[PDB]
Every structure is written in C-alpha cells, then in structure tokens.
C-alpha cells in the first residue's frame, strides 16, 4: 500500500552502480525510474534516476529528522510514499521544466520469474551449457571479424591495383595514339620513297605495342573479376556477422541472468568463480 517495506518496493534495487543503472535504463521511454542506494554510501541519500528528454536525469532525496523529500522543506514520511505520490502526480510543481510522471518502474521480480529451473543443480548445469555456447559464439565472432578485416584489406589493395592498371592503360593508349599520329606521315613518306625495311620495323614495333596492351587488358580484367569475387565474399561475411551478433548478445544476457540468479541464493562466490569458466570471460 502507501507505506510498506522499501526492500519489498519493486522500484528499489539496492547497491547497484550508476553504470548498471544506465545499462538498465538504456533506450527506454520517458518516465522510467528506479531507486538505488547512493554511490557515496551516506545513509539517507537515495538517488532517483528518471529518464526525461532521453537523458538519465538524477534527482537526490534529502533525508532529515525521519522524513524524506526532494528539497526543503521535507513533507513526506518515506521513500515509498514519495515514489507513490510522484507516480500519481507529475513533477512539474517541483521543477517547472521537469513535466513528467514516474510511469514505468523497473522491477527486479520480472527477472526473478523469467529464469526457469530454479533448483541449484539445474541452474548450474544450464550456466555451464550456456557458457560453453557463449564461448563458441564469441570465438566464431572473433574469427569472423578477423576474416572481415582481412577481406577489407584485400579489397582496398586490389582497388588500388585496378586503379593503377587503369592509369597504365591510359598512358599506353596516349602513347599509341601519338605513335599512329607520327607513323601515318612517316609511313606515307617512306612509301613515297619506296623502301620496306623501316616499314616492317615500324609495323613490328606497333604489333609488339598492341600485344603488350592486350596483355595488360587481360591482366586488368582478371584482377577486376577477382575483385568482384572478393566483394561477394566480403558481403557474405558481413551478412554472417550481422546474423551472428544478436545470438551472441542473447547468450551473454541469459548467461548473466543465470549467474545473478545463482548468486542470489546464498551459495559461495568462490564456487561461482570456479564453476563459471575460471577464465578471461567477462562474466
């Protein structure tokens, strides 16, 4: 009702860091709130985090002579009464800019019931299996990311190479156009003269030039085809990465949920450390 246990209050969370508060209130609608013990650990602070305007606003509850309130004078009996009153009515009177209510309270009981197989051996075995799945997914994601980086490097260097081939072809074609421009008059003059040795020499040079240009065109075409194939592989690897990320996120989230459920049972944290992976895993 109006004045019950603060511990039993669902918006109460206990000793959670502001980092966890921000993680819980990330990308949530206006009015979302939770009450946590202050980081300073001074008794009676009870920082409240409401999300208005997209930002995790912080409002501090001053405690005095067995009363609570946002600012002097204190006119409320308890934190539960304060939270309920400002859920019922908006905060515009306290701060004219803060025109919002405390609509959606984060509750620890939903995660209490989402987790299944509550018994100790079941949660331990599920934690082990999900940790193995998470490690498999993480190693798969790391291999995929290194392959993606390697393929991106290959694509960049091959694009530079194909640009260099284009420039080489431009230079060769300009030179061959100049060759024809001079050789038209040169061959005409030597045809007027009546000799064929220089004519055949010039023709031999021209066909050698044409053979070289054809070879460079073939190499450029092969490089371009390889570039298209590598681009296809790059797109496929990007698609696999985008597919595999959400599953890794969900595995991590459910593994952490199982860890918190196990820890909220009075069992030994040393057993928790030994059981989980005793490894470089984040959590």
């Amino acid at each position: 009702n109006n004045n019950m246990s603060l511990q039993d209050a669902e918006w109460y969370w206990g000793d959670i860091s502001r980092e966890e508060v921000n993680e819980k209130l990330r990308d949530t609608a206006d009015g979302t709130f939770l009450v946590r013990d202050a980081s300073t650990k001074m008794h009676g602070d009870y920082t409240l985090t409401l999300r208005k305007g997209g930002n995790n606003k912080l409002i501090k509850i001053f405690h005095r002579d067995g009363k609570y309130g946002f600012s002097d004078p204190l006119t409320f009996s308890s934190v539960v009464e304060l939270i309920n009153h400002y859920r019922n009515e908006s905060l515009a009177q306290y701060n004219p800019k803060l025109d919002v209510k405390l609509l959606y309270p984060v509750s620890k009981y939903q995660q209490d019931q989402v987790v299944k197989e509550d018994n100790i051996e079941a949660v331990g075995k599920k934690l082990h299996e999900y940790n193995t799945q998470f490690q498999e997914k993480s190693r798969e994601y790391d291999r995929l990311y290194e392959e993606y980086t390697r393929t991106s490097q290959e694509i960049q260097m091959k694009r530079t190479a194909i640009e260099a081939f284009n420039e080489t072809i431009k230079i060769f074609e300009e030179q061959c156009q100049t060759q024809e421009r001079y050789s038209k008059e040169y061959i005409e003059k030597f045809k007027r003269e009546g000799n064929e040795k220089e004519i055949q020499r010039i023709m031999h040079n021209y066909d050698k030039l044409k053979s070289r240009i054809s070879e460079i065109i073939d190499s450029r075409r092969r490089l371009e085809e390889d570039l298209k194939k590598q681009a296809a592989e790059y797109r496929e690897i990007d698609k696999r990465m985008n597919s595999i990320k959400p599953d890794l996120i969900q595995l991590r989230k459910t593994r952490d949920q199982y860890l918190m459920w196990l820890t909220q049972k009075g069992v030994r944290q040393k057993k928790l450390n030994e059981w989980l992976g005793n490894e470089n895993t984040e959590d």
Partner: protein, 978 residues
C-alpha cells in the same frame, strides 16, 4: 621490388617502343642515357631530341602517375607498378615535384589525392594552414641563426626551476659537481675539467668558470656527452632534465664545449615555399520559427540475412556531445528485403534553439526476435552529420552518407563518439537523406547578436560557498544531480570567483535553450583563465562548443610549457578527432608549437602517422601531416630516412612471420642474417635518428648481436652503435626491440601515466623509482620497444646459475651488490616495489607472471608488457589487486625469515600509503587523460564506464580515511601471509 633482371619498356615521345635490359640498382639518368643511346638504331630518331630536354614518367604501386624530376634516385626505390617508363616533356616544377614526392613518402600516401578531393572545407583548410606555417617560419627566422638553433635543438628544461628538497639535500652545499670536456685539439684528444658550481648557475656562468679553470662574447656552447642535447637558452643549470636526472640518480654529469660557429655552420638553411594551391539572402538562425524535420529515404546496400532478421530500421537523434538535445526518433516502414522509408521525421527541438555544435547521429538497426515480449535491436551501420558546416550554415537540401561498420563491442544503437562524415569507401550502406529548405541560407548568428540576446533575457554566507567548493573539488565524472545543476546555473554569476568550476557549470547549462547558452557564452567570454591541466578538460568530447574549446585553447596558449606539451601530446593529438571541423584553434596551436620545436615536431609526426591506417580520421591526419612536412624544414629528410628504415623492418617481420611460421629458429636466423647483409637494407638501416628519441643516433648495425627472441611474436632484437665521438660516457651501443603484431598503444598510455605519477610523487616529496621506458607506435600492430640494459626477469634469475627457493632473487642481488652498496640496492628495490604496487593496483594491470617483470643490477625492478591497462579484460568498475610475492617480501625484509615482523615492512607500507594518497589527490588529471584517450580506438575504454574503474580503484566515492582503510585491507588480503 624488382630483384631479378628487368626488361623495361620505353615509351618514347614519337611513339617508339624498345625494351632495354638493366640491373635493379640502375639510376634514372643512366637509364635515360642508355635509352637515347638505343633509340638511334631504331627508326623515327630524327624527331628525337636531346636527353636534357626530356624527363621520365610512370605509375607507382600507389596508383598515381609521378613525373620523375629526380634522376639520381635508383630504379628499385621508384616502386613502379609495371616495368615501363615513358618519356615526356617537363611540365611541372623541379623543387615543387621533388618536395611533393618527399612529403608523400613521409606521409604514406600521395600528395595528389588532396588535390583530387574537391571538398571546399578541405581546400580552405589547405589554403589557410599556410598562414600558420608562414608565421612559424618567420618566428624561426627571427634571430639568425640562434633562433634556428633553438628550433632544431630545443632546451630540455623542466617547468620547475626549484628542486624538491629530497634531492636538493643530495647536493653538497647546493653545489653541483660537473665534468667539462674540451676536445679542441689537433687530434681528437679528450681532456676533462671537473667543475663544482652552484645549481642556479646559467650556461654563461658555467662557461666562464670552465674558461677560468682552463686558465685562459662567448663563442662556445655546452653539449651533453653522448647525445644531441644542447644547453642554449640561459636557464638555471639544475632546470635541465638530464642534469636533474643526474642529481636524482647520483650520477656524474658530463658536458663538452662546441664552438658556436661550428654548430651554426652545421645547421642547414631551411626554406619554405608556398605550394601551388596557395595561388589557386542569408538570415540568422534565430529568425527561423519551426521544429527540426529530417527525411530518410533508403539504404542502398544492407548486408542482412533474410531468414534470420525480418525488419530493419534506422534510429536517429540530435546530439550535443554525448547528451541528446531531444528524444530519439525511429523509423519503421519496410522489412529487410526492400529497404526504403521515405518518412519525414520530426524532432521536438526548435530550429532557433539549435546549438552551434549540434549533430545528427544515425544508425541502421535490425530488430530480431520480434516474437515474444523482448525486442532486440542490433545496429548494422552508423553515421553522423554535423548539422552546422564550417561556414556556420545549417545543412540544407538533399544529402547522402555512406555508413561505417559498428565498432567491436559497441552495443548501443547510436554512436555519437564517432567522427562526423561519410565513409570514403563506396561499397558500404549509403543512406540518402533530406533537410528542409527555408528559402534562404540558415546561418548561426554572430557574437554581437549572441551578446544582445545574453544578459537581456534576465557555508551560506551570501551563497552556499561550501557546496560550491565541494562540487569544484569533485572530479569531473562524478554524478551531478538536477538540484546541483540548478544551483550552479542559478549561482553562475558568482562562479567566476571559483574559476575551477567552469566544467561543472558547463554541464549545468541546458544546451537546448538559446537563452541559457547565450548567458553561458557571455560568462565564458569574461571568464578568468585557469590551470592548463584543467583547461585540457574542456577539449574532450563532452564539451563540443566552439567557445568552450577556444577558451581551453587560449588557456593552453597562456600556460602550457613545452615539457608539459610533450607529456600531453598523445592526448592533445587524440582530441583532434573530437573536433567537428578541419581548421580550428586547437590544430592551429598544435601546429604552431610543432613548427617551433623539433622534438614536438618529431612526436607530432609519428603520432599522426601512427594512425594513417584508420580511415576514420585518415584524411584529416594526412592533410595535417602534409602541412607539417611542408613547413618542417630540413627534418623532412631525417623523417624520410626513419620511414624507410621502418618500412624495411615491417617487410622483414612480415616475411619472417607469415610465409615461414613453420620454419625453425635456426633457419629463420639464417634468412634474417642474409637479408640484413643485403646491401640496400644495410644502407637504409644505417645512420638515422632514432624515433624513440631524436637525439639518440643509430649507427652501424651489429649483425652478430641482432637476433629474434623466443617470444611467441618473434620480435627483432636490433643492435645499433653510437656514432657520437664520446659514446663511451653514456652508452656504446643501442639495442631496440622491433615489435610487429601487438598493439603498443595501451603500453604507451600506461607509461605516460607512470611517468606522470613519478612527477607527482617527486614533487610531493617521495622517492619511488619507476622506468617509463620508451615505446612508440609507428602504424598498425607495429612499434618500437627500447631495451633496458642489465635487466633480467625473475624467470631468468631462477634459471641462471644451474639455478625453487624464493631466496634466489635475494641471493642474486646480494652477489651483484656488496659492501655499502647493498643498503642502497635494497632501498631502491623497496621504493620501486612501492611504486609498482601502487601503480598496478590503481590502473588495474592484469596478471603479472615472472616473465614480464625484471630486476636490474643495482636492485631496481620494473614491469614489462602491460597489455591491458584496466581490468576490463575481466570487468569494469572482487577486482584485480596488486601482487607482492614471497621473494619480494624476503628481499625487502633483507632475507629475514619473518618478513612481516621487520621494520622495513611497515616502512614500505607507509610509502605505499603516501603514494596512494598523492595519486588520489591528483586523480582529476588522470581522469581527464583517460577520458581524452576515448577516441584512440583501443579495445578498453570506448565510452566512460571503463574509465570509471579508476574511480573504483582510487575510491573517489568514499572519503580519504575510508579510502585509506580500503587500500590497507586490499594490501592485507593481497599477500594473505605470502
């Protein structure tokens, strides 16, 4: 890159084709001589002109056409794409093209690319940075040639003329004994003159004393023996860093007399010429009365699987830093098969209330698992738009942006940390957008209108002074509540008397209110200057405002000494990314200070060039490097030599690792020695300034000493020599570890922090010993590691001598140091352990085994590879404590079996206490440094919540006594009796 015989095609200007054969080492002038000696036999030689009228042109592996005005350069270094050469008439300028080629080689990318790009912001940056370059040049050419001598040889002076008393007591009556060498003789005959002079003596007094004892308008100067360090500007002789370090370590200083005219002639003349590009209806924002509307049309490329993900959506917002100015708006119209939205998105923020540093952060996200209550949104690609351009105009009309991949581990959908701008790569998600047209150019109002708007809208003695001071002394990343913000903004007029509170008042102001922003603009315009280490707070991503950053830059210009600038250069470079433009006061200041000090220039260049591979800021850093190498004088050639040497080293390491990973150690040694003996490699490696220190000169390689270590990464143990005449006084040879494969930027940051902790501790009055040795990052997963001499890991110590008794380290130190040296060795070892324990606890360096921790001969110890500079290898914000093992305890206890029962134990604990309290007192600067290192791209920090682990370890949440008790219990739990 052409070892075997080459058949170079010759592209004659009349149209001829001929294939000459030449060796890989031939020069361009020789090639041209042979080429016009062979074209005579073939036809069409009548039109052929003389060699001197023609030059070369080809294409390089970087896909550019270079017209080769430099003929002396050999064939191999040309780096042709294909073995072909074209002969054309010269059209460019000799010096301009040669300089552009050198600049391009130093940068790593051709200078022609920046002319190819036609962005008006880029072009204006390139045109207007030349004013700064010319001012720096004129400043260098002010006192000829002493000013140029000062530029090339910076006085290595500390910011504090006075000495801490713990080393001032090490002076004898306040007099420093210094050896003076005079080498002026027909032969290189060295004679020494020992001088005992006061600490406050200036170099002219030192030289007068040296002359007087030599028993004879000053024509001589004084140079450190064994290094390229000079004492030029008249400062107290104790202020110089080498001499103060000699005082600290008890080492005998050494100096030597060089003629002023000799060095002045030895300095080359520097010329700076303007490049080619040097010659080559609006209404205010506040008149607009409408909301901010933006349309999203389509995502051109999206790499999404049809089966796994059904719907994909793009999420937007308006940001000013990391804080959304208004609530985010989402689009959801089409599935992944046909991405096209065409939805006019509207933002609940008025146009006239748009801050000057407003942005637009987007992200294409894929909602997966729509079934069930929980909806999971995963981002596909992200992009940012700077709603205001460099001319103070709001973006209008149609726009398009390619989108970058999401960084590794960045879960949250929007990425406002990243740099504004499109992905230069074009096979990436392109998201065409739209911006409303207001029939005119939407310009931000000028400061006259800002001033007209401002000031027109408008314990506890008179104000709550104690709370104001408490918030001031609170660190920047602590929680600041809404009541505190309202109090700060209400008492803004009184905050001027506390200038240390400007960051908190800035966070207090509401950025989406033009009245509040105008009032804060006036306040900052009349704000008194503050400490430079506090003004560096206002350059982080949390303060994007132009006037905030201009005030911070003015404070840096007023109060930043050059040693502090060299300490904070990593961060002042890293906060160049957070700038929203190209040309701005921070980069103007940094370039002006990099073209008047060659050590600043050296590390400026190498830090900027360390990040060419990252495409995000590659263009800005390339343009900055172009301007620097344009106006850096003669140091460009030394930089080019360093780049050549490290290119050869990188290629060596690559070939060693990937082609022949399975190759055995001995055969890899044979390959290494062969390629080192190869002459072009040999010549490139000999004789260049070391990158870790521009003063240290690298000389003749010692192929017998060079090797590859047994570490899993195969690093290069490269042994040079010292070409200085008096190498014996400091060090005969230089050995350096070339590391290719591991990111040394975390180690760079940790060593910066360690050096700063020593500075803090010594200024406070403690004597804890650290070795912040040299580390440099020279690119991607490549860097240099300076070797410390006479060092051994405890694993080496245990192995040596035969050798598990933890008494092995103590026995080794006892054998190394005997007599009265033992007491000093044990004291140094204990002070080093105190520093190490405090530092590794505070920064959360990971597991230290025996093989990353070394003991010197004089008892000093130190730590090698930091790797992870915070506990985020496990988790952010029990955490990793410092470790102090049984051998350490035994040696600190001088071999007593009951280590905890001795007096030295509690002396060590008391030193740890004082050190921890000093660091906790100065944690604001450490927080600012770690927060300015957010844009590095290191895996660790990446938002703020990973910096917060330093707040956890330093216990900034608690009070002083509570934090001290917390450290005590941490130490006791750590050892747990061993």
């Amino acid at each position: 890159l052409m070892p075997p015989r080459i058949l170079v095609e010759c592209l004659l200007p009349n149209g001829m084709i001929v294939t000459l054969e030449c060796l890989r080492e031939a020069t361009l002038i020789t090639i041209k001589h042979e080429l016009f000696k062979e074209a005579r036999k073939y036809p069409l030689h009548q039109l052929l002109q003389d060699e001197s009228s023609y030059i070369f042109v080809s294409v390089t592996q970087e896909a550019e056409r270079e017209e080769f005005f430099d003929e002396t350069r050999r064939l191999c270094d040309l780096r042709l794409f294909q073995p072909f050469l074209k002969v054309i008439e010269p059209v460019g300028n000799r010096e301009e093209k040669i300089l552009n080629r050198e600049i391009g080689f130093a940068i790593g990318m051709p200078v022609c690319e920046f002319d190819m790009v036609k962005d008006p912001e880029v072009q204006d940056f390139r045109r207007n940075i030349l004013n700064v370059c010319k001012e720096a040049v004129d400043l260098r050419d002010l006192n000829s040639p002493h000013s140029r001598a000062m530029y090339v040889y910076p006085p290595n002076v500390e910011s504090s003329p006075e000495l801490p008393k713990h080393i001032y007591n090490k002076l004898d009556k306040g007099q420093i004994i210094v050896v003076i060498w005079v080498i002026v003789s027909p032969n290189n005959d060295k004679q020494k003159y020992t001088l005992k002079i006061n600490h406050d003596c200036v170099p002219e007094q030192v030289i007068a004393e040296a002359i007087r004892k030599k028993t004879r308008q000053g024509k001589y100067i004084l140079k450190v023996c064994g290094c390229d360090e000079y004492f030029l500007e008249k400062y107290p002789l104790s202020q110089y860093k080498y001499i103060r370090s000699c005082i600290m370590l008890g080492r005998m200083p050494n100096l030597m007399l060089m003629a002023k005219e000799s060095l002045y002639s030895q300095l080359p003349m520097d010329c700076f010429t303007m490049p080619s590009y040097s010659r080559r209806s609006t209404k205010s924002l506040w008149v607009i009365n409408s909301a901010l509307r933006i349309k999203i049309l389509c995502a051109t490329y999206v790499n999404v699987n049809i089966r796994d993900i059904d719907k994909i959506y793009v999420r937007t917002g308006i940001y000013h830093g990391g804080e959304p100015l208004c609530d985010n708006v989402n689009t959801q119209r089409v599935p992944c098969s046909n991405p096209r939205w065409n939805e006019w998105l509207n933002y609940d923020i008025y146009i006239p209330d748009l801050p000057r540093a407003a942005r637009l952060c987007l992200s294409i996200c894929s909602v997966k698992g729509r079934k069930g209550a929980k909806e999971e949104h995963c981002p596909l690609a992200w992009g940012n738009i700077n709603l205001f351009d460099y001319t103070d105009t709001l973006v209008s009309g149609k726009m398009a942006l390619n989108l970058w991949p999401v960084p590794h581990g960045l879960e949250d959908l929007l990425n406002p940390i990243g740099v504004t701008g499109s992905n230069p790569n074009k096979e990436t998600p392109c998201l065409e957008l739209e911006f409303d047209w207001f029939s005119s150019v939407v310009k931000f109002p000028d400061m006259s209108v800002i001033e007209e708007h401002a000031n027109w809208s408008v314990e506890l003695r008179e104000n709550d002074k104690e709370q104001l001071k408490a918030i001031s002394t609170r660190d920047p990343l602590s929680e600041i509540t809404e009541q505190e913000k309202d109090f700060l903004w209400s008492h803004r007029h009184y905050c001027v008397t506390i200038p240390e509170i400007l960051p908190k008042l800035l966070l207090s102001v509401k950025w989406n209110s033009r009245d509040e922003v105008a009032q804060m603009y006036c306040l900052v315009k009349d704000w008194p200057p503050i400490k430079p280490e506090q003004a560096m707070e206002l350059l982080d991503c949390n303060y994007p405002d132009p006037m905030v950053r201009g005030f911070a830059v003015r404070c840096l210009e007023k109060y930043l000494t050059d040693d502090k600038l060299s300490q904070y250069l990593i961060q002042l470079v890293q906060v160049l990314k957070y700038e929203q433009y190209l040309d701005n006061l921070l980069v103007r200041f940094l370039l002006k200070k990099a073209l008047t000090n060659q050590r600043i220039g050296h590390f400026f260049f190498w830090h900027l060039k360390s990040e060419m591979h990252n495409k995000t800021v590659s263009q800005r850093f390339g343009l900055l490097l172009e301007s620097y190498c344009r106006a850096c004088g003669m140091y460009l050639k030394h930089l080019n030599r360093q780049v050549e040497a490290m290119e050869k080293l990188i290629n060596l390491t690559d070939i060693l690792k990937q082609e022949k990973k399975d190759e055995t150690q001995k055969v890899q040694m044979k390959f290494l020695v062969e390629q080192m003996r190869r002459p072009d490699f040999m010549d490139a490696l000999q004789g260049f300034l070391s990158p870790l220190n521009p003063a240290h000169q690298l000389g003749n390689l010692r192929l017998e000493e060079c090797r590859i270590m047994s570490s899993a990464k195969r690093p290069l143990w490269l042994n040079w020599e010292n070409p200085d005449i008096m190498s014996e006084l400091l060090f005969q040879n230089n050995e350096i570890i070339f590391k290719n494969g591991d990111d040394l930027r975390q180690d760079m940051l940790t060593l910066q922090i360690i050096r700063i902790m020593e500075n803090i501790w010594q200024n406070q009055g403690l004597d804890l010993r650290m070795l912040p040795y040299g580390c440099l990052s020279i690119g991607d997963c490549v860097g240099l590691i300076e070797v410390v001499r006479n060092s051994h890991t405890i694993m080496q110590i245990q192995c040596k001598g035969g050798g598990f008794n933890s008494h092995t380290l103590h026995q080794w130190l006892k054998d190394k140091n005997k007599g009265e040296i033992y007491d000093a060795a044990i004291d140094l070892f204990t002070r080093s352990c105190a520093g190490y324990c405090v530092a590794t606890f505070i920064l959360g360096i990971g597991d230290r085994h025996n093989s990353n921790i070394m003991v010197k001969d004089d008892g000093q110890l130190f730590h090698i590879d930091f790797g992870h500079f915070l506990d985020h290898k496990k988790k952010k914000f029990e955490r990793v404590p410092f470790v102090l093992t049984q051998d350490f305890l035994i040696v600190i206890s001088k071999g007593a079996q009951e280590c905890t029962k001795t007096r030295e134990f509690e002396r060590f604990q008391e030193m740890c206490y004082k050190a921890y309290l000093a660091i906790r007192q100065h944690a604001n600067l450490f927080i600012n440094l770690f927060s300015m290192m957010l844009g590095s791209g290191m895996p660790e920090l990446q938002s703020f919540d990973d910096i917060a682990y330093i707040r956890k370890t330093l216990a900034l949440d608690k009070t002083e006594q509570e934090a001290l008790e917390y450290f005590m219990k941490q130490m006791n739990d750590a050892r747990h009796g061993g």
